[PDB]
Symmetry: D3
């Protein structure tokens, strides 16, 4: 890869946006590389969790400023979005700096989001005369109503700080800048110390549950619970738990 | 009861989880006792509001680690959940310590939630190899997306503090530990100084409203408003005000 | 066409509506409601107006409310002072200058940018007088977390939420020194209006219409607004001004 | 023992018969209390797998005859004779023997199999006496196409839908010779009860809980009921009987 | 006077007649403007309780004028591009304002009903047709998507019937008989008696209590937007509003006094 | 070459024929794998605009026959059996039901765009008769048949069969065809659809199907996205021009 790095260490794959001189702006080539990296992580059985991070002053500064023959063209373009609707493995994003426009997709569609004290969040589209549809409908599911709308309306003229992002729960943790990647990998290791199919099933329970009312969400979640109950790991876990022991999960 | 305490003082019933030697873990017996206490509160006309709290260092540490002949077997098991879908009286939870797994059900389905400075919140199910379906679909309606998911994925290896819970609005107030029950009863008294059928009607407007889109939610809420408008208390309220005296609510 | 209970003023591309019954702490009367709706309609239909600011005179922003079934509006929840956010495209900013309760919360829960004075407080007194707050609190429930909304409902007039707590939960986006509230509101208005107004409108619609469907559908739905804006002259001017390192000159076409 | 209805159990079928033919089976408060006690009895008698509801005479049910907020039900729409389809898993079949109007329609719109006599007619008279039939007609609107449901609402007592038209639109599944109605209802009941009762119940729940959400979610949701039924002894017996070319013996376990 | 439609009031019934038979009642921008003024007039005249809509000639309505399809994709309004809220949503063409009007509307389909003509069939309260009427949508045959029209049809016709209509375009026409069979219409009428039967139905609806009629229509239509259980609770709001009317007291009072009610629409 | 089905392309129509008449076209795991390959092939061949599915013999499809766990995403949801991938494929599908259609066979009836049937076709689901819940199949039936008709089909199991005539009456199917002319009529309908503008056909199908997942008002606005996408096509300029010039359009599927 020329625009990113892809590395595997144990059960964690790490994708690093690696075009710091262009402030990690997404080109078509970068987008193609990201999708190959995502596919690789989804299909490598050794990989249980994906970490996404950037290099330099920007995490991702957005997109660089035959027709209808494929299904995807009928929906919103996805740009760098990880394939959260079709991949069960959890994703953690570690925001190292400026995060704007299509950069927000990682913040709004991955499972754990942490940031450097230096990170900032915004969307500049209205400042160049365009509507940022996908990005901001996603932001609207994380930030309260008038905060999401303020971000949308202010365009490039305002930036949300890491501290404010943490306050509202747009991120779960602020990390000293030089320790960002280390902490990301620590959290990853902790999540991977849990039973991976239970983790995947729980994530699905939550995310599919968000699409329906609570009562239905509970009944729906029983499907994933029942699927996980049949796993070998679900038979091993409860004995391990009462013995305060870390089992060697088999992901089966 | 041998696993809980149930006490009524004026218009407030207080249920206290009272198995500190199992850190208020829910056994089947405790669950049966809780449901009898809930039913008692719901059916005693003197009781307007239920307070739930625990004893010791745990509020509730979760569940202890003929077929299809009853309707409840077709749905998710409810464990200690108060019957918020079928009871109109408000419930306040005062979290005195560790609150995890099934303990979160009080945090996510009761109307006012406060906590001791010593309270912590988490769910250990993925650490045991299991999916906590019901519990975490509920948590996902209170915490922002990636905060709910982080709690789900971290399992027993991380605990949310009372301070962070307050910051995100998972709880509304932090109380000095030794004053928790006192403050819960003070809040209870304040709620009960308002018109109880208006309180119940307003709670229903909000909760039933959450299940449908906003515009329909507004119209739906009119039903409860109209029902309350017919009450004697809706006449007493403005009458007490014009006579510069405290209203004397009769809950009719 | 001259208002007794409010003020309506246009300066450049910003209309400012000021609730102006300070002796009644800006309580909404039926006459005030009629005047507000005329002012909203005027702002929505005047092409010069790109953005509406709403604020209050005095120390209360709004202290709430004070032939049968012959008109359609009577069949739905009464709307009181609510701006018609479901049938307008221009953004609205609310600057909460003081007490905000009952129907006052409608501006907080249905406008696009909400800021407040350090002196603002938020509550709903309905249950304290024996009545249900429907519309108001269902709306609050879409902004505040579940048990915070319910606490506000259940406490009635016996508790206030501070501006600081509001800010913490994202009920408001900013707290302003009291004497500078209006100045800051107009500053934010100017900044929004320095962006491309049809893009602002389209983005607001993407968000608001998107909240009524699941995320995936919200994304596809938003494409409609994006496609409409792509046809505008401003959509060509914007990237052009950017590549030429110069300010865009928006025509709102 | 009941004075407005009959309740009889024969094998696995309970039959509730509306039995006030001189008042055209109008629902009184006393009849409503009796119905609910019958429903509760049916739901709690393990021998009963299925409930049949029918009437006597020229009316199936001609509607309702022309402390406050202390119980939860008073916060919702009154239910009148509606069987408890949201809280009871056993299937219910309605056999409409004649006039079915107002609250009578509840059995048509909330039970699982609906058949009728060639003589049956369907309507709602509420607008003809100045009232809104809320519950009844929101339910009708889930069974008849949009403008058919609205026409029934708007015409009031002045028009009656025939059994033939009802069948054509799928408001009912079968028209029966009048004197054979009860025989055929019981035959259908026997056929349903010849299938595995927990599978029947699980399938009904899949469908009815599924209707509340989009199809994709309805499919995933249905897996819960399928998994629950897979763990029954009957789910083992069924395919075992089939492979042994033998009739299954259901234990409802 | 209108030049593309007729608008007439008799007693409690307003009748709008699409009146461009030479153009097969194709909707032009001018016709659409006239329709909207007629709708507003009907909704605001307290004497009018019910609106009947029908057409003239071999077509009820043959759709939006293809002649007027914008070269550049911008739907033309009275005002500049995106300056008004309605431009951000699907164009409504001739659709009566069913979301913001409480008075019931009956459509009597006299002939060809296609494209935007289907909006009356899918968004009015009572729909009847001449034995000659046919129903279809030709959009895919001219390279365009019927969005609004067919999402509306999909709420009335079963899944694969709606999709067949979408996919067949102008090459297939649903008969009145089939429309009746599926409940797209409630009645087929001999052609020469169509208007007469429409007014008979109208008179019957108007013999009921008009606020109860309006409240019941709202219960149903707002109820379609949420699950059944919530629909039931929601419908109580309309029921409660109507219970406060004099007519709601008059109805049962007349019945107990064994006499006919007299509605005041209050 | 496929053993359990036939896949054939003629002009813009692909035809898949379920071809296990000795098992009454019961779905085996091998048949399911072959079907999915055929669906993928049809979706990815630009010459194919429309897919016809039919069966051979007395049965269209008599239902199902009697990879590490959770390692693939499909295992997290309901098994799909023979269902065409209607959520991820834009090309329309027409099903021509030639006989018995039960259990998993109903998936074609409930999730394809045009459904026709032989006068001999019948429809039912036997699962409750063998002690099982047919979840996916019947939640889908419940979106097409009225409430108590769907429930009757679910509860009656194998003991009742809906006729083609009743299925037509309720709109479960759109046409009954003389048995020996079924395939011919299917191909005729296919040709007629393919005489329309294909990207308009696909965009309209999406408007309807994605619209069914949300309330009507949102559905109208959502449909504008597809309408706007199609407006940019060459075919969207050719169509109205051909119409006003009273001449046949020449579609390029662009």
């Amino acid at each position: 890869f020329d625009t990113i790095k892809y590395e595997v260490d144990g059960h964690t794959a790490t994708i690093t946006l690696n075009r710091p001189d262009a402030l990690n702006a997404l080109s078509p080539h970068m987008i193609t590389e990201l999708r190959a990296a995502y596919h690789e992580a989804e299909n490598d059985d050794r990989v249980w969790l994906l970490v996404v991070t950037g290099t330099g002053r920007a995490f991702c500064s957005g997109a660089d400023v035959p027709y209808l023959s494929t299904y995807d063209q009928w929906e919103a373009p996805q740009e760098g979005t990880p394939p959260f609707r079709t991949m069960a493995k959890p994703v953690l994003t570690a925001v190292n700096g400026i995060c704007c426009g299509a950069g927000m997709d990682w913040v709004t569609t991955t499972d754990i989001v942490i940031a450097s004290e230096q990170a900032t969040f915004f969307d500049p589209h209205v400042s160049i005369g365009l509507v940022a549809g996908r990005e901001l409908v996603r932001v609207s599911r994380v930030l309260p109503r008038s905060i999401a709308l303020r971000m949308a309306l202010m365009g490039k003229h305002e930036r949300m700080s890491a501290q404010r992002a943490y306050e509202l729960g747009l991120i779960s943790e602020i990390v000293e800048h030089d320790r960002l990647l280390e902490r990301a990998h620590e959290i990853a290791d902790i999540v991977n110390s849990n039973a991976p199919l239970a983790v995947r099933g729980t994530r699905l329970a939550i995310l599919k549950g968000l699409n329906v009312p609570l009562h239905e969400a509970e009944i729906l979640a029983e499907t994933f619970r029942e699927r996980v109950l049949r796993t070998e790991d679900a038979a091993e876990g409860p004995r391990a738990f009462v013995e305060k022991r870390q089992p060697n999960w088999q992901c089966r």
